[PDB]
Amino acid sequence: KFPRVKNWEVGSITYDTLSAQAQQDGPCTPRRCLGSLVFPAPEQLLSQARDFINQYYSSIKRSGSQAHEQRLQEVEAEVAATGTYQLRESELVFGAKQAWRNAPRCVGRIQWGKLQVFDARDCRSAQEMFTYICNHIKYATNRGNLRSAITVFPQRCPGRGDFRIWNSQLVRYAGYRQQDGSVRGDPANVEITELCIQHGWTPGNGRFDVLPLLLQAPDEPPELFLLPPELVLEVPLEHPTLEWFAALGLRWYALPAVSNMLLEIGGLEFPAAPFSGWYMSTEIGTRNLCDPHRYNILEDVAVCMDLDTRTTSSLWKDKAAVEINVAVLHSYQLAKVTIVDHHAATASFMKHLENEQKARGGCPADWAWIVPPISGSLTPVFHQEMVNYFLSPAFRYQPDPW
Amino acid sequence: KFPRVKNWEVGSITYDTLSAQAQQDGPCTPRRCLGSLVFPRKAPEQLLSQARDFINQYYSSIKRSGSQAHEQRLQEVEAEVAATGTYQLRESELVFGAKQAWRNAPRCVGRIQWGKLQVFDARDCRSAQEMFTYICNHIKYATNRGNLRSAITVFPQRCPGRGDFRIWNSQLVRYAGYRQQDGSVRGDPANVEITELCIQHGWTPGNGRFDVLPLLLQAPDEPPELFLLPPELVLEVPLEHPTLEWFAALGLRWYALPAVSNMLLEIGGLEFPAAPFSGWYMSTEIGTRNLCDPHRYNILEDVAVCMDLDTRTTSSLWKDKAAVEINVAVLHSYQLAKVTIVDHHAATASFMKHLENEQKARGGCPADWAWIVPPISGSLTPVFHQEMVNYFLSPAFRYQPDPWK
Ligand code: HEM
Numbered sequence: 001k002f003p004r005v006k007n008w009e010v011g012s013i014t015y016d017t018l019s020a021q022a023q024q025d026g027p028c029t030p031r032r033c034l035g036s037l038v039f040p041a042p043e044q045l046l047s048q049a050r051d052f053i054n055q056y057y058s059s060i061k062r063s064g065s066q067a068h069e070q071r072l073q074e075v076e077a078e079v080a081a082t083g084t085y086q087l088r089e090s091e092l093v094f095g096a097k098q099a100w101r102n103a104p105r106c107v108g109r110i111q112w113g114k115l116q117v118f119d120a121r122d123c124r125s126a127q128e129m130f131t132y133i134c135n136h137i138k139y140a141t142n143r144g145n146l147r148s149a150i151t152v153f154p155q156r157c158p159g160r161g162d163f164r165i166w167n168s169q170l171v172r173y174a175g176y177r178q179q180d181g182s183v184r185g186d187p188a189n190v191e192i193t194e195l196c197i198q199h200g201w202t203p204g205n206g207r208f209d210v211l212p213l214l215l216q217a218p219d220e221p222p223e224l225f226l227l228p229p230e231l232v233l234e235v236p237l238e239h240p241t242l243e244w245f246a247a248l249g250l251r252w253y254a255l256p257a258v259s260n261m262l263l264e265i266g267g268l269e270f271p272a273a274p275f276s277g278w279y280m281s282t283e284i285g286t287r288n289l290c291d292p293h294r295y296n297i298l299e300d301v302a303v304c305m306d307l308d309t310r311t312t313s314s315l316w317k318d319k320a321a322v323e324i325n326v327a328v329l330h331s332y333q334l335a336k337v338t339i340v341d342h343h344a345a346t347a348s349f350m351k352h353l354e355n356e357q358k359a360r361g362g363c364p365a366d367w368a369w370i371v372p373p374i375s376g377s378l379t380p381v382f383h384q385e386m387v388n389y390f391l392s393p394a395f396r397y398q399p400d401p402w
Numbered sequence: 403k404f405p406r407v408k409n410w411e412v413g414s415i416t417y418d419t420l421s422a423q424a425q426q427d428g429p430c431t432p433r434r435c436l437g438s439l440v441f442p443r444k445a446p447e448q449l450l451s452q453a454r455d456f457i458n459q460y461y462s463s464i465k466r467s468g469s470q471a472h473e474q475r476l477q478e479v480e481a482e483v484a485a486t487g488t489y490q491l492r493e494s495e496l497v498f499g500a501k502q503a504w505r506n507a508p509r510c511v512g513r514i515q516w517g518k519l520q521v522f523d524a525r526d527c528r529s530a531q532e533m534f535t536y537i538c539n540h541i542k543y544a545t546n547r548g549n550l551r552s553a554i555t556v557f558p559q560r561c562p563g564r565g566d567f568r569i570w571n572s573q574l575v576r577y578a579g580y581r582q583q584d585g586s587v588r589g590d591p592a593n594v595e596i597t598e599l600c601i602q603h604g605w606t607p608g609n610g611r612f613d614v615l616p617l618l619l620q621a622p623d624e625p626p627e628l629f630l631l632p633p634e635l636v637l638e639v640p641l642e643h644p645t646l647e648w649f650a651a652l653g654l655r656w657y658a659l660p661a662v663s664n665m666l667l668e669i670g671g672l673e674f675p676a677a678p679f680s681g682w683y684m685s686t687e688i689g690t691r692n693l694c695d696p697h698r699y700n701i702l703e704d705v706a707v708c709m710d711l712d713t714r715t716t717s718s719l720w721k722d723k724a725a726v727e728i729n730v731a732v733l734h735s736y737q738l739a740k741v742t743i744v745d746h747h748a749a750t751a752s753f754m755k756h757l758e759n760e761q762k763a764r765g766g767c768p769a770d771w772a773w774i775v776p777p778i779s780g781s782l783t784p785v786f787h788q789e790m791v792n793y794f795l796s797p798a799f800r801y802q803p804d805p806w807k
């Protein structure tokens with residue numbers, strides 16, 4: 001049947017009819033659920049291309065029109081002639097927005113219709129890739145008034161290497177392996193930091209050293225590019241009432257610009273299509289700064305707050321985490337950099353689910369990722385049953401290029 | 403092959419081979435995951451296969467696989483099923499099966515304790531009055547003046563020709579929820595339906611926020627019978643906060659003993675529709691879900707206003723701050739009352755140890771990530787960073803239909 005989906009806070013029931021159109025298989029079976037796991041031929045391409053073109057023409061209310069038929073014939077004729085095809089720019093924009101819309105782990109999808117799409121499919125060199133990336137960062141950052149954007153580099157094609165951005169985000173802090181095995185800076189980025197050093201980057205020795213970009217043009221080794229510091233907007237973290245918090249020297253960057261995912265549209269694959277929006281504050285204050293395998297600053301802050309750190313039942317961890325999240329929100333607002341707290345974001349996502357139920361009959365959503373990492377059940381999404389499935393166009397994980 | 407399971411905090415990787423023994427289907431398919439749904443679902447040769455599997459589990463657990471006793475029990479069960487359509491557990495098997503069902507429960511974070519369970523054999527029970535006796539003795543034993551002891555009381559199994567024993571209440575201790583004319587609820591909205599059933603069956607209702615409900619106890623083929631718990635049996639904890647002195651004036655309280663009474667215990671193909679079990683609370687159950695859920699007592703905004711927090715904008719994180727202090731109050735108050743309680747940090751740390759133990763003992767552990775991760779401070783706990791595999795093993799505790807529907 002269609003899954004029955006309940007909201008336990010309100011008692012409201014929906015049926016996800018959209019899931020019946022799920023393209024690819026996920027990791028679960030009737031025997032066991034793997035929903036919590038982080039990492040789950042012209043005929044085939046033409047089949048995906050036709051489904052996408054049909055999708056697009058349905059969305060603009062032109063199904064079965066002459067333009068629809070003409071576009072299908074164009075795609076068939078191009079695949080027959082070349083083994084691949086080119087998206088019209090309107091289709092690329094639609095495809096990128098749909099891939100965002102379809103992303104089950106994105107709580108920010110209320111924004112999905114508002115996406116600046118930079119068409120870099122004419123890109124030829126890593127140097128030009130860098131210029132596109134800087135223009136993206138400048139546009140999206142917008143002096144702190146963040147604007148969602150994606151830059152689409154040339155698609156994958158047979159007999160030619162991919163464009164790749166080796167960095168997982170356009171802005172990443174270095175992580176330096178110390179002699180005793182610990183990390184200075186961001187442990188998430190030890191591997192890319194060492195790759196940057198291997199390719200000729202002179203490392204810093206700070207906790208928040210912005211990494212250079214490793215940009216790979218087809219069939220070339222990656223090339224190192226330094227981001228101009230004026231392009232990388234950062235927010236020093238301070239707290240509204242804990243005056244010592246600023247002295248901790250914590251900071252984060254304004255622009256979450258994810259650069260290692262593959263964008264798939266109509267069977268075409270764009271291995272370099274960095275996209276950016278703005279942060280939800282728990283990403284910074286809870287995960288990046290408090291994860292034990294990231295900056296792991298929770299106990300430092302708890303020491304500064306004079307909390308009792310050797311009984312768990314004092315909830316010192318929870319109190320310290322809240323004040324770090326408060327500091328993130330306060331600091332981005334003070335700096336006039338767009339940020340959304342986890343209450344506002346989850347409330348907007350509930351509105352999104354409602355919109356999508358009416359628009360498409362459901363919404364693929366990954367509960368474990370949508371529910372924020374603090375205050376889970378204080379947010380409405382905790383009480384919302386969700387159905388997780390894969391629709392295309394999509395953003396996919398892909399192997400690291402090295 | 404077997405699911406590869408990663409802990410992202412440590413980077414350690416295991417394979418859940420136990421999942422290959424999953425005995426029932428869950429709700430997910432390769433096309434879509436339904437892991438976040440609360441309620442996923444809903445003979446002689448099938449009974450024998452489940453019985454043989456269970457007997458094999460039992461004899462393996464005591465390291466007597468292949469013994470004459472093992473073979474005799476298999477033959478006896480097969481003969482009993484052939485002759486009577488069913489069979490009876492030996493007392494030792496019942497104890498093992500109850501503990502296994504707890505061990506197998508994917509949504510239970512407290513399973514480090516699974517070997518420590520007092521099993522009361524009430525399979526000789528004959529009436530609702532006798533059910534009440536067993537229940538009162540369970541509550542008394544389990545409460546233990548606040549030094550809580552995990553226990554289960556197993557009433558007679560389902561059997562053809564005879565209705566079931568059922569406890570209609572979802573827990574042995576529940577606060578009444580009284581629907582008001584404006585649609586609001588006085589008391590616990592979770593219990594509106596059982597409250598109305600108690601009233602329909604002759605209970606004179608209170609009008610408080612924390613009125614302990616009577617028990618509706620159903621003997622086979624009888625309408626349910628109403629029993630009031632002696633108030634001295636029901637240990638309760640008044641809630642205060644160590645530094646927010648007005649908090650005590652909220653008049654909030656909760657009960658000591660979580661005693662779940664509406665789940666079905668399945669052991670070796672046998673079904674025990676009345677098998678209430680109790681342990682102790684994890685503090686987030688009370689302080690985060692029961693008190694702060696918008697559809698439960700919903701106290702968050704009133705606490706936040708009394709804390710003088712700015713409730714006009716969400717980015718002050720007033721909800722988070724108020725919820726933390728409510729959880730502090732629960733922990734402080736139970737400790738002050740000398741009633742066993744575990745905070746979510748301690749509980750999840752112990753569950754990580756349990757996962758480690760079970761990897762070695764059985765090659766895996768069925769776990770429901772969405773239920774194991776606490777409802778506040780999720781990623782501050784180790785379980786958030788632990789990938790989990792959810793699957794159904796038997797013996798098991800299962801949901802079952804309400805007996806009035
Ligand atoms: C506009 C504001 C946005 C907000 C507040 C937001 C929020 C988030 C958050 C909190 C996550 C989880 C990330 C993590 O935990 O690591 C996420 C995931 C994701 N976002 Fe959004 N997002 C926004 C815009 C966008 C845009 C513009 C795109 C693409 C066009 C996008 C695509 C995705 C994808 C594909 C994921 C899944 C990543 C994965 O599976 O690892 N998001 N988003």
Ligand code: HEM
Nearest residue numbers: 504507509510511512515552553679680681682683684799
């Ligand atoms: C000893 C201390 C224990 C602690 C701290 C504990 C903790 C928990 C918690 C926090 C939940 C989630 C409940 C909810 O959110 O509604 C749970 C569920 C569960 N517990 Fe445990 N538990 C304990 C003992 C037991 C015992 C003794 C049994 C049975 C013999 C048991 C069986 C279960 C089952 C079957 C569930 C799943 C309920 C469902 O699926 O709705 N637990 N436990």
Ligand SMILES: N=C(Nc1cccc(CNCCc2ccc(-c3ccccc3)cc2CN)c1)c1ccco1
Nearest residue numbers: 187188256257258275276277278279280283293294
């Ligand atoms: N607002 C936003 N955010 C956002 C959205 C999508 C993806 C991400 C980044 N997702 C990172 C997931 C991750 C986290 C930690 C580790 C890691 C690995 C090794 C050691 C320690 C940590 C690895 C990964 C990727 N597998 C952020 C945003 C970005 C663009 C638009 O909106």
Ligand SMILES: N=C(Nc1cccc(CNCCc2ccc(-c3ccccc3)cc2CN)c1)c1ccco1
Nearest residue numbers: 591592660661662679680681682683684687697698
């Ligand atoms: N420590 C323990 N705890 C625990 C363990 C298992 C089960 C439960 C109770 N599980 C409650 C689930 C629930 C929550 C809210 C509603 C509800 C329904 C309608 C409106 C509002 C709320 C309904 C249900 C039952 N489906 C507690 C414990 C009990 C026994 C041993 O250990």
Ligand SMILES: C[C@H](O)[C@H](O)[C@H]1CNc2nc(N)[nH]c(=O)c2N1
Nearest residue numbers: 036037038368369786787788789
């Ligand atoms: C193991 C577990 O899936 C992992 O820790 C997940 C849980 N939920 C998440 N949710 C978000 N938004 N981001 C994450 O990285 C994760 N990590």
Ligand SMILES: C[C@H](O)[C@H](O)[C@H]1CNc2nc(N)[nH]c(=O)c2N1
Nearest residue numbers: 382383384385438439440772773
């Ligand atoms: C919709 C969602 O499944 C529901 O709110 C779940 C989430 N996780 C939970 N986790 C626990 N421990 N208890 C619950 O009742 C729930 N409820």
Ligand SMILES: [Cl-]
Nearest residue numbers: 256283284288
């Ligand atoms: Cl990030």
Ligand SMILES: [Cl-]
Nearest residue numbers: 660687688692
């Ligand atoms: Cl409860």
Ligand SMILES: [Gd]
Nearest residue numbers: 303304305306
């Ligand atoms: Gd000091």
Ligand SMILES: [Gd]
Nearest residue numbers: 644645646647
């Ligand atoms: Gd005070």
Ligand SMILES: [Zn+2]
Nearest residue numbers: 028033430435
């Ligand atoms: Zn699943």
